[PDB]
Amino acid sequence: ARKSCCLKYTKRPLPLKRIKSYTIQSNEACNIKAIIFTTKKGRKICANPNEKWVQKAMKHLDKK
C-alpha cells in the first residue's frame, strides 16, 4: 500500500471541469512519467502526459 508513483495511465480521459489539480510524476523518480490528476472528489487519477487532453488539462491546472 501507499504508492507515490503510477505505473499505469487511465484508459478513460477525465473532464477538465472535474479536475482540481495535478502532480508531476517524474520518470526520474518513478518508473514512468504519469501526471496524477486529482478530481473534485479528490480522487487520484494517473493520466498519460502524452495525451492531448492532458496537455490542455496541465496548462489549465498550471495556471492556478
Side-chain angles (χ1 to χ4, degrees):
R2 298 180 181 170
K3 58 179 64 179
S4 305
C5 300
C6 296
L7 295 68
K8 60 184 299 182
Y9 313 94
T10 181
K11 181 181 178 301
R12 176 185 174 202
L14 295 174
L16 177 62
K17 295 178 178 179
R18 189 61 59 173
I19 307 171
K20 302 305 300 299
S21 297
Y22 66 76
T23 304
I24 302 180
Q25 165 178 327
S26 57
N27 192 327
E28 179 183 87
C30 302
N31 293 30
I32 64 178
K33 180 178 179 178
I35 302 298
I36 303 79
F37 282 42
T38 306
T39 51
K40 309 201 173 179
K41 290 69 179 300
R43 183 180 181 189
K44 298 300 182 62
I45 304 74
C46 306
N48 171 213
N50 301 147
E51 306 188 67
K52 184 177 182 177
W53 69 277
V54 175
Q55 308 302 331
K56 300 178 180 298
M58 290 193 299
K59 189 177 188 60
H60 175 82
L61 300 173
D62 182 72
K63 295 175 181 297
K64 187 177 182 179

